[PDB]
């Protein structure tokens, strides 16, 4: 489709994908690209940097403060007082000034903006973080952390307990704990009162406390996380820790009776001889309908209707799409429609995988459920394609160089036959090197480079009191940490449905290297 037909379609990730594809093939003229900013659902990342190679946009700065960016560190004392304050938002700017000008600007600002005063005087020292910490300036602490992550220093109880009141705190704690940077910051965060944190912050501080073997503080942190978490999956992750640390059976019972199906609730059910949860069964009699499951545009359309529906338009959609041909959509609508209380694990386009061994089938289906919910024409924000969410680099390399498919286009990933076959091929490569389906899941999402780098560390997936569950919490990419846990649960479930059950404790045992 030409840029002109693309312009007639609604903004969406599909449209973006296709505009990107013209860009990468250099088929968009400077003229085509004029009105094109209005035609991009999500102007971030690749399509942005690619369209800015044609029409650079170097904006934007408000007409108000335009005079203010005509001054440099050399001429800043000639600037009016508003301009002075604007430029001092940048800690790099402040670092650029000489110390005489910092002293002067610091006196100007001590009345109305002592935040500025403190940063100004801080950069007149060999250690700005220490100066800020001594003044207990919370806003300054975070501006310094964002400016430079290499500042590290011990923080007292008074101070650490103020940090969680700032929006930066969560990202700050997550980062330094899973990356294992700022050891003095980490050690100091052992004195945060659990009362003062909640949710993810509380959870990550529980993980922190485990790493220093402070199991009491860890429980309190995990407990506070259990009581505050919005989603049940996260509550469960926290209840599981509560149990592992103390071993109260009230905790494990709550976890075995969870409405959320996840690895922690599954493991707990196994440990308590609780029966496997009820998996729905969808077998629509209706054979097909009008809907083109191979049209990416139709999907994005119907996907917006499903998202933006009262739980009553849903029942109109559910019935419209209650067919064998639109089964993946049916299950998608149903999942939302029953408020995520029912467990849907379909096996669509099964003829394409029925001749693989059942353990392989489970792995493929588990990946596809998380990647796509089995939507053939699914496109991610990084433009990963189809049910198995292949990046176009990898899809083209497999399809052109390896499997030598004739007339291979990357849009072939929209075909179930192909998605499942390339999925099988790529998983074969990963399994043969990594073995565990959890490790395979990490590498399917984050690449095998990152996974091998992680497994080579001697603090990851080794033996230890709290292993392998602690390592699972310390996987360094957030997206991959979450992905693994989910795909693993999907794997258990699908092995079960396939009559190829495995104890999840068996999976956890083979995560440890001896």
Ligand X SMILES: CC(=O)N[C@H]1[C@H](O[C@H]2[C@H]3C[C@H]4[C@@H]2OC(=O)[C@H]4C3)O[C@H](CO)[C@@H](O)[C@@H]1O
User: Residue 370 or 471: which CB sits closer to ligand X?
Assistant: 370
| CA–CA dist 186, 98 (Å, integer) | 33
370 is a site residue for ligand X (CB under 6 A): yes
User: Residue 42 or 166: which CB sits closer to ligand X?
Assistant: 42
Break sites following residues in the chain (C–N > 2.5 A): none
Let me know: does 94 contact 102? Beta carbons within 8 Å. Answer: yes
| CA–CA dist 300, 303 (Å, integer) | 5
Part in contact with ligand X (CB under 6 A); list of ranges 77-85, 125-133, 238-246, 376-384:
376-384
User: Residue 188 or 490: which CB sits closer to ligand X?
Assistant: 490
Angle between helices 232-246 and 215-228 (to 10 degrees): 160
The count of residues interacting with ligand X (CB under 6 A) is: 11
Which two tokens mark 451? 């996974």
478 is a site residue for ligand X (CB under 6 A): no
Among 372, 410, 436, 451, binds ligand X (CB under 6 A): 372
State which residue has the least CB distance to ligand X. Answer: 380
| CA–CA dist 395, 21 (Å, integer) | 14
Residue 22's Cβ-side half-sphere holds a number of Cα atoms within 13 Å equal to: 21
400 is a site residue for ligand X (CB under 6 A): no
DSSP code of residue 279: P
Sign of CA dihedral 152, 156, 160, 163: negative
Among 85, 262, 445, 451, binds ligand X (CB under 6 A): 445
Least distance from ligand X to the Cβ atom of residue 373, Å = 4
Which two tokens mark 157? 């109880």
Among 380, 478, 505, 510, binds ligand X (CB under 6 A): 380
331 CB neighbour count, 10 Å cutoff: 21
Let me know: does 242 contact 224? Beta carbons within 8 Å. Answer: no
User: Residue 364 or 378: which CB sits closer to ligand X?
Assistant: 378
Part in contact with ligand X (CB under 6 A); list of ranges 187-195, 320-328, 370-378, 420-428:
370-378
Among 28, 302, 346, 378, binds ligand X (CB under 6 A): 378
Least distance from ligand X to the Cβ atom of residue 76, Å = 46
Among 204, 483, 491, 508, binds ligand X (CB under 6 A): 483
User: Residue 136 or 295: which CB sits closer to ligand X?
Assistant: 295
Part in contact with ligand X (CB under 6 A); list of ranges 71-79, 196-204, 368-376, 459-467:
368-376
Among 24, 280, 479, 509, binds ligand X (CB under 6 A): 479
Beta bridge partners of 385: 379, 390
Q: What spatial distance separates the first Cα and last Cα of the chain, rounded to whole Å? A: 56
Tracing tokens 């009191």 back to the chain, one arrives at 465
Which two tokens mark 443? 């590498």
Least distance from ligand X to the Cβ atom of residue 256, Å = 25
| CA–CA dist 144, 129 (Å, integer) | 7
Least distance from ligand X to the Cβ atom of residue 66, Å = 40
Site residues for ligand X per CB under 6 A: 370-373, 378, 380, 384, 389, 445, 479, 483
């Amino acid at each position: 489709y030409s840029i002109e037909k693309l312009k007639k379609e609604e903004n969406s990730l599909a449209k973006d994908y296709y505009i990107y594809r013209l860009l990468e093939k250099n088929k968009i003229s400077k003229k085509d690209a004029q009105d094109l900013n209005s035609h991009i659902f999500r102007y971030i990342g690749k399509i942005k940097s690619e369209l800015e190679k044609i029409i650079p946009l170097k904006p934007y700065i408000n007409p108000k403060y335009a005079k203010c960016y005509t001054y440099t560190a050399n001429t800043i004392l000639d600037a009016n007082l508003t301009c002075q304050s604007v430029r001092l938002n940048s800690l790099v700017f402040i670092a650029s000034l000489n110390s005489k000008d910092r002293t002067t600007l610091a006196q100007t600002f001590k009345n109305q903006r002592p935040d500025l005063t403190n940063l100004l005087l801080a950069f007149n020292t060999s250690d700005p973080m220490s100066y800020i910490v001594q003044k207990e300036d919370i806003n300054g602490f975070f501006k310094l952390y964002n400016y430079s992550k290499k500042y590290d220093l011990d923080l007292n109880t008074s101070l650490v307990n103020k940090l969680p009141n700032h929006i930066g705190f969560k990202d700050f704690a997550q980062n330094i704990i899973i990356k294992k940077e700022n050891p003095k910051f980490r050690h100091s965060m052992l004195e945060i009162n659990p009362e003062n944190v909640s949710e993810d912050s509380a959870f990550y501080l529980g993980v922190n406390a485990l790493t220093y073997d402070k199991t009491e503080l860890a429980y309190d942190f995990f407990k506070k996380a259990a009581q505050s978490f919005k989603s049940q999956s996260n509550k469960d992750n926290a209840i599981f820790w509560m149990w592992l640390i103390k071993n109260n059976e009230e905790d494990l019972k709550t976890l075995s009776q969870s409405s959320s199906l996840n690895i922690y609730s599954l493991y707990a059910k196994e440990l308590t001889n609780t029966p496997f949860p009820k998996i729905e069964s969808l077998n629509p009699s209706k054979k097909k309908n009008n809907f083109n499951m191979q049209d990416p545009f139709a999907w994005q359309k119907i996907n917006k209707q499903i998202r933006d529906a009262n739980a009553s338009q849903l029942d109109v959609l559910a019935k419209e799409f209650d067919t064998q041909e639109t089964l993946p959509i049916y299950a998608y609508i149903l999942e939302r429609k029953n408020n995520f209380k029912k467990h849907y694990f379909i096996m669509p386009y099964y003829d394409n995988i029925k001749d693989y061994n059942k353990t392989r089938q489970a792995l493929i289906l588990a990946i596809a459920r998380q990647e796509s919910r089995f939507i053939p024409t699914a496109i991610s924000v990084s433009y990963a394609l189809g049910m198995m969410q292949f990046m176009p680099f990898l899809a083209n390399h497999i399809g052109e160089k390896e499997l030598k498919i004739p007339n291979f286009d990357q849009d072939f990933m929209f075909k179930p036959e192909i998605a499942y076959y390339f999925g099988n091929y790529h998983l074969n490569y990963l399994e043969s090197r990594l073995k565990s389906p959890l490790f395979v899941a990490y590498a399917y999402n984050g690449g095998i480079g990152f996974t091998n780098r992680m497994l080579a560390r001697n603090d990851m997936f080794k033996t230890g009191k709290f292993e392998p569950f602690l390592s699972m919490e310390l996987v360094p990419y957030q997206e991959s940490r979450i992905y693994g846990k989910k795909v693993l649960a999907n794997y258990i479930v699908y092995r079960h449905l396939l009559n190829d059950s495995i104890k999840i404790s068996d999976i956890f045992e083979n995560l440890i290297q001896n």
